[PDB]
Amino acid sequence: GIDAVYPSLVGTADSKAEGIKNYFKLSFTLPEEQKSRTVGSEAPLKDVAQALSSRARYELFTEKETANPAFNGEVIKRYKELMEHGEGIADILRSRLAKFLNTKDVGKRFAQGTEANRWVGGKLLNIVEQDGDTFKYNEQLLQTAVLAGLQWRLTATSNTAIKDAKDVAAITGIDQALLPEGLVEQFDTGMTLTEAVSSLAQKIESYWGLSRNPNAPLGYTKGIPTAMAAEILAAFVESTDVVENIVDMSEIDPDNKKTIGLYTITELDSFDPINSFPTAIEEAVLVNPTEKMFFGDDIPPVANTQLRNPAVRNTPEQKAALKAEQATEFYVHTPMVQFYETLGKDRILELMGAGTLNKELLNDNHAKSLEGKNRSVEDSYNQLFSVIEQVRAQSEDISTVPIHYAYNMTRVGRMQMLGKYNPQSAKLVREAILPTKATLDLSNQNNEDFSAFQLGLAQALDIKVHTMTREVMSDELTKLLEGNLKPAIDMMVEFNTTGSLPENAVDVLNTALGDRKSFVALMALMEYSRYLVAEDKSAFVTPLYVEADGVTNGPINAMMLMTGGLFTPDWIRNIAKGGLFIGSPNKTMNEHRSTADNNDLYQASTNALMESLGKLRSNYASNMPIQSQIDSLLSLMDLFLPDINLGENGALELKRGIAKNPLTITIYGSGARGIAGKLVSSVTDAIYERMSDVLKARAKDPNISAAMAMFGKQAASEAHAEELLARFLKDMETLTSTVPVKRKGVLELQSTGTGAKGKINPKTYTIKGEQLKALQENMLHFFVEPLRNGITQTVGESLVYSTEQLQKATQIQSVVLEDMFKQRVQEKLAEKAKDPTWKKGDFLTQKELNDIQASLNNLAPMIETGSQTFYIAGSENAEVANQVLATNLDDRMRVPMSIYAPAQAGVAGIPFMTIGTGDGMMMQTLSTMKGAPKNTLKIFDGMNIGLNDITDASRKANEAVYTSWQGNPIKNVYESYAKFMKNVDFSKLSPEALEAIGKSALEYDQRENATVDDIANAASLIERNLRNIALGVDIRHKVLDKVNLSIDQMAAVGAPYQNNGKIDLSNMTPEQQADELNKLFREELEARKQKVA
């Protein structure tokens, strides 16, 4: 079969043969249904170039009566030129092989019998053919691979994952908190070796259109396509389509010996015709294209498995959710596109980015940051217009072309739109391509339609709409429209009248908006002006939306989902800050914030921090050095952060802002040190930025004083700015030269020796490593520690207990799964080493890996909720195989063999379950529930709704919230841990693993002497803890359901969901309600106790 297709490849298609064995024929087979149209083609490049030569030929090739109308004259011309470039890449590959065969006589040794086709660096030899005294590439395989490379080169960058600080930390091996400014930026734009080859190889294999032999070693089924990809990347480096940069980590800190390769694809002109249709090759080669836009009723297919978790199938309910979201039609909002176009890329960067950089009128590290910002915006802008260019081809009126987006379920249950820059992920794109739309009657400002319009405009303009009633926000909005924004509104009225903008459009927008500036704010100015010049106000069509947005969503979800003790009055008061109102029929968040409690969860946490800080000050009331250090940290923060304020007489004011990120990531399992690093980071960014201000402050007046050049605005007078500068220098000095240390359970100050001082140079000023670390230690002990105490005090110690038990159970289970998998692999390999047809380098077959995974099912690797599936340990790492998979023909680009297998979970269990059974379950329900809202854009913890359906959609969202609050993630974990506990055998664990388990199940002093029996006993203890927690959560949810509740967690609109519970708890204090609820709790405890018969 396959031999008939590739009859001339070198070697025998029999793993038993004694001579050269061809592992390409042994590893792959032809599918029972064609996947690639090039299979059988003698000259794929020639044949595909032919297909791309005219619309008529493309239609014949793809056996379709119609071709994407974007495939026009100019596009066809570009693809003809791109095909000629494919011949160049093909030519470079041919010379590289010849060079490889000539070097150290590999070709001669291979012809003589040496099995070089089994070397990790010679796997490509499996796709060559004898040619006279040498070997040559099989043209069909080589040319198809090139076609894969061309498509990859055109769209890979638009499908790369975004890299955050943590990612860069993992890659570079540098502490996330001590990363040098710009590093994350440099790494987020380029691709690591693994990233590049992996995506390239995946693409090559799909284009070869064959199927893997389940009984063939991974060293070939995966290694040959990877070997081909490595060569193609090498070819692209020679052609300059890709730039390789090897970043030496030692340059940043001499201990780090890692040299990391980065690959950046050369960008095509933003105006290149190819951008309007960058997927012609993919749609021509594949019978079922992956990359393509979905227009009209061309709908994306539904993914069968969870993203990057092959072993996890999307449940029926998750698939229904994905189908529902992919069904939604998005439409281009022409006015906004025209606005972006008129402004221009240069002015959008100036308005929403860093504008033009004068890399000498701003601090070096600041500039690196600004440059990072412009990039994100510029890339979003080019991406939107590439899409617009293809949409415009679909018809005369671009605003009528329906667009669909593909989604998939992530590891944590979130429905993620696929692609780097889309409406769900990119703010700029979000205001140009929308699914929201409504025709409103705005002829009378007393209409319900006009109220909705106002709500959308207000929210977009940064008015806190969920903190006040509709009537009150209407007045706030009116004030802004008739005041500060008035000049911008006039400019937009003129734009919507003549289509022209002033030369100072950026300045008018900037001044009018102030800190309200955002893309959605531009949409509000755009839409309000359009209504003003509107002909028929009785039927105003607008995509303006209102986002029903969760109020402290993650933290509140965790509180409802994992608090398992009796009800307390503090919890009742705090949970109300998240929209769960007890005994207050039809109460909304708007009313709550304006009449009952103006502090949300962030503020309450901050207020707890303040109290915990005072407590810390007392414990060291006599220690002047300690007090002075605390004063310096607050002084430094008050100097650059807006959320920290210090009055004239010393009064400390802390705004909810400082607790936002910290509370959020604390619910995602973050440690205290990470929070400290981020807090320091925001401080330093402000400093670097202040330095830049000086540079220009002095360029304007070479006589301006340093004090006034650095604090000239933030102060009242000169002697006043002079004392601000005194605070700065002193603070930086004490915070970098002295750090707090935990000795004997007490705080003691230590000299670092690496103090910071000297005449500052606002051009090169840079807080070094040791100094950022000193700053971090001070931040940790004098600010983050008490913040953590306040947070715990706010969300409840019961919740913290649950999350720790959850973390322990899932870590323990992940450690076992990881170790057992590794062991079964070593056992199998040892067994293969006795097989003569097998060789080291080859690995296990896919079937063998499958068997090993299956042997772990009794340890319950998956957590099931009944509508979602979570696999916490699931991952892909190079540690299982611990070997190279393939290299390029120059012996470089050595791609490690990565394998899908369980790995230690760390704290991931908390985020997985919180995010998954919280917002993830809620959105899933909202997409599939009876009367599920249509035409919305869901963004995990918020949903954009069209102005015509804000009331019902918001109510449905709140009902969806209530539905997810019926979940019990701890019970789900318990049922998994329970099966695991009865089948596990800790004795079969490596000492390395057993130790990790002891850290989770025993208290630090019991680890050293801990016997298998000891940890095994402790592990079973955790199981009982989980059972008891699950039982309480379950009871609480049933009890709460009997009471009258009003839920408005997805706030803004003021349409709370009523559970209509019968037990009336109105006219009762939180203490009274807690007592009544606990009575119901105890009642059920007895009922579900002895009587369930």
Added chain:
DNA sequence: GTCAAAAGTTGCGAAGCAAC
């Protein structure tokens, strides 16, 4: 120990350790 996906390069010589 923040989730969303992983994660160093290269000579010698043909695996996998040494040097950076």
